[PDB]
Amino acid sequence: TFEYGDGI
Amino acid sequence: TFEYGDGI
Amino acid sequence: AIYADNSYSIGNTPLVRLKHFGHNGNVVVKIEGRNPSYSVKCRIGANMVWQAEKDGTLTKGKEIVDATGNTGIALAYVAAARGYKITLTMPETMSLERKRLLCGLGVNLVLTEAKGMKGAIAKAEEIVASDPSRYVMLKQFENPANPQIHRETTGPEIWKDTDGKVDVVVAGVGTGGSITGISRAIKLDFGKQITSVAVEPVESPVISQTLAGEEVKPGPHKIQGIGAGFIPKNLDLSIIDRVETVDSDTALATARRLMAEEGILAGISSGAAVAAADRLAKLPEFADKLIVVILPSASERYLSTALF
Amino acid sequence: AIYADNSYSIGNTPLVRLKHFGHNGNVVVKIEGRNPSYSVKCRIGANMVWQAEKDGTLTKGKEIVDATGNTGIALAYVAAARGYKITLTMPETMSLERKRLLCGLGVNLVLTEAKGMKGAIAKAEEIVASDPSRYVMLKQFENPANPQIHRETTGPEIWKDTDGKVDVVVAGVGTGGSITGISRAIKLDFGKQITSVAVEPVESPVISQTLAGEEVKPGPHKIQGIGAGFIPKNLDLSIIDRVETVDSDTALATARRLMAEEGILAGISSGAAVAAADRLAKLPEFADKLIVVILPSASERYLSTALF
Ligand SMILES: CC(=O)OC[C@H](N)C(=O)O
Ligand SMILES: CC(=O)OC[C@H](N)C(=O)O
Numbered sequence: 101t102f103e104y105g106d107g108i
Numbered sequence: 109t110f111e112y113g114d115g116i
Numbered sequence: 117a118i119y120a121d122n123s124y125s126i127g128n129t130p131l132v133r134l135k136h137f138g139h140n141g142n143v144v145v146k147i148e149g150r151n152p153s154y155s156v157k158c159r160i161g162a163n164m165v166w167q168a169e170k171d172g173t174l175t176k177g178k179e180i181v182d183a184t185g186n187t188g189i190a191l192a193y194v195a196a197a198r199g200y201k202i203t204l205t206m207p208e209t210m211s212l213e214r215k216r217l218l219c220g221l222g223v224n225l226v227l228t229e230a231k232g233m234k235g236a237i238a239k240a241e242e243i244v245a246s247d248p249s250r251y252v253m254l255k256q257f258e259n260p261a262n263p264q265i266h267r268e269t270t271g272p273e274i275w276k277d278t279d280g281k282v283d284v285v286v287a288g289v290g291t292g293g294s295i296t297g298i299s300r301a302i303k304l305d306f307g308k309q310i311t312s313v314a315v316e317p318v319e320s321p322v323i324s325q326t327l328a329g330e331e332v333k334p335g336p337h338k339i340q341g342i343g344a345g346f347i348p349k350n351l352d353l354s355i356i357d358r359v360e361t362v363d364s365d366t367a368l369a370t371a372r373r374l375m376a377e378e379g380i381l382a383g384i385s386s387g388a389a390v391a392a393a394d395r396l397a398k399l400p401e402f403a404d405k406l407i408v409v410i411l412p413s414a415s416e417r418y419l420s421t422a423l424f
Numbered sequence: 425a426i427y428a429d430n431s432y433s434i435g436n437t438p439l440v441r442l443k444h445f446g447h448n449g450n451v452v453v454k455i456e457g458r459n460p461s462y463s464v465k466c467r468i469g470a471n472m473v474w475q476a477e478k479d480g481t482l483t484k485g486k487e488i489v490d491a492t493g494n495t496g497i498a499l500a501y502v503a504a505a506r507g508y509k510i511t512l513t514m515p516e517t518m519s520l521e522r523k524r525l526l527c528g529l530g531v532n533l534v535l536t537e538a539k540g541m542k543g544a545i546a547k548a549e550e551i552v553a554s555d556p557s558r559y560v561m562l563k564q565f566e567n568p569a570n571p572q573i574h575r576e577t578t579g580p581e582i583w584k585d586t587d588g589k590v591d592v593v594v595a596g597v598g599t600g601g602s603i604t605g606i607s608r609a610i611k612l613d614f615g616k617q618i619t620s621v622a623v624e625p626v627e628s629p630v631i632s633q634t635l636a637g638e639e640v641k642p643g644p645h646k647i648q649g650i651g652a653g654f655i656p657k658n659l660d661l662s663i664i665d666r667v668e669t670v671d672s673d674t675a676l677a678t679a680r681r682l683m684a685e686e687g688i689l690a691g692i693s694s695g696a697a698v699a700a701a702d703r704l705a706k707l708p709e710f711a712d713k714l715i716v717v718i719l720p721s722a723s724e725r726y727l728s729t730a731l732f
């Protein structure tokens with residue numbers, strides 16, 4: 101899972 | 109390592 | 117047509133019509149995987165650096181620093197291509213299998229173990245704090261050169277390849293750069309009143325909540341590249357006509373179907389974008405509408421994820 | 425410019441000039457990684473199927489069968505894109521981390537454990553034997569549609585992007601399709617007497633040995649995609665002007681340098697091709713010569729290999 105700016 | 113048609 | 121370095125060869129990505137989605141071929145996709153470092157972010161990696169060069173904040177000597185993953189890889193290759201040192205802050209955790217890739221591009225990852233973005237942005241800022249004269253943080257979430265490049269390339273490519281017949285643009289939002297620049301191009305530069313559709317996870321629908329004036333409650337989700345859990349500055353709400361939400365599982369399954377049924381090597385958020393476009397496309401409203409969908413990245417960035 | 429399916433969007437790959445190789449920018453590279461399934465083989469995946477459709481051997485119902493990895497992935501997406509079942513024979517072994525990828529494209533891998541190509545070609549043939557009416561093997565090593573597509577796309581792209589100024593073409597040989605089609609295009613269709621350079625591993629220099637009329641002794645090597653250990657039919661010796669050999673380690677290191685110094689996400693044989701072009705390029709003979717190098721694939725196909 102991704103959340104809050106990470107993964108972008 | 110590769111040899112003889114494999115890897116192509 | 118020979119590019120001085122890899123950064124200048126950004127864009128010119130193709131439109132492929134889908135056969136197993138939408139209705140009588142009204143859904144077509146833009147393969148952003150076909151860029152120098154293989155995601156849509158290659159375009160902003162290039163233009164953020166160029167603009168920083170142009171306005172003097174980036175120069176020979178100064179090191180690019182930032183926190184980010186597709187954007188990291190984009191900045192990685194532009195750094196290498198143009199001769200910059202670069203530090204990219206990242207946690208230990210998710211969005212991994214990418215270390216040796218960024219490591220392979222010569223990046224020096226700040227091995228930052230509370231594993232999340234603030235932990236990096238803190239270290240980003242702290243690094244940024246340590247020596248302002250030596251570091252430059254390009255700030256993708258707010259840097260106007262992000263939407264500007266899509267305004268100048270991504271959007272005009274869509275207009276030309278459809279010959280002004282695009283009626284709808286569907287795109288996941290991470291920075292909002294993609295949909296913002298594209299919309300501006302088509303609506304303002306070419307003057308066509310299309311429908312711009314932002315896509316976000318149902319698990320973290322902060323745009324849907326904001327526009328509704330509801331409590332903004334973000335959450336964890338699997339759709340890498342979108343769902344930042346806040347409204348980013350590079351997201352121009354004013355041009356957004358509609359917001360669709362999509363769940364992680366459906367997004368993943370849509371990505372698998374893109375491979376197996378369409379022979380299109382798409383990444384996870386590409387599935388999210390398609391699932392939302394398919395929904396719109398099956399509304400009689402959009403039956404005579406040409407729907408253009410941004411497919412942000414490609415399958416092989418996702419080998420070690422739930423997609424496979 | 426909207427392609428009916430992913431197969432029609434093949435090619436149109438860019439030329440990027442190198443800064444850390446050759447002499448005063450006389451070495452430029454063609455990024456074949458920027459194709460629908462991300463290798464140069466996408467072009468032959470498309471055209472081998474189209475031609476088989478055109479001459480009636482491939483039809484609705486019949487299953488594509490073959491032994492191959494980039495070619496497998498190319499046929500995989502074309503099968504999916506055009507609606508064919510496909511079986512791809514492969515060993516248990518090397519060139520792996522690719523199972524779930526091919527599996528992800530809906531291929532059914534013949535789980536063939538003597539792990540090598542004959543073991544597959546036997547099973548390929550045996551499958552092919554079982555029901556001639558149901559199976560079609562497209563035979564990349566000899567199928568003329570392989571070089572033909574490069575004659576019609578890869579070569580003309582090179583001519584146009586250089587405006588007839590290419591003087592040298594450097595390309596690794598697997599099928600020989602790439603160099604054969606390209607040479608024919610430039611030399612015969614446009615009429616320019618360029619130097620075509622085949623590249624092969626020093627570990628298995630069967631072309632160098634053949635032309636010298638020496639004992640043909642092939643061997644194992646790490647440069648995936650080239651060095652088949654025999655002279656393939658799709659290799660037209662007649663147009664070959666020169667053969668350069670390159671060792672696995674140098675090839676790998678050249679690939680790493682392509683990432684770190686040029687910001688170009690190249691695969692292993694792309695490094696082999698560059699190492700040979702750099703050598704040629706530093707000969708005063710080739711100082712005023714424009715050298716074009718085929719970079720067959722991209723880095724992320726190689727995550728689990730010695731390249732990383
Ligand atoms: C473990 C975790 O969720 O970290 C929080 C961080 N801000 C992030 O969402 O990236
Ligand atoms: C183990 C092995 O070398 O197998 C031999 C096979 N013909 C091949 O080279 O692919």
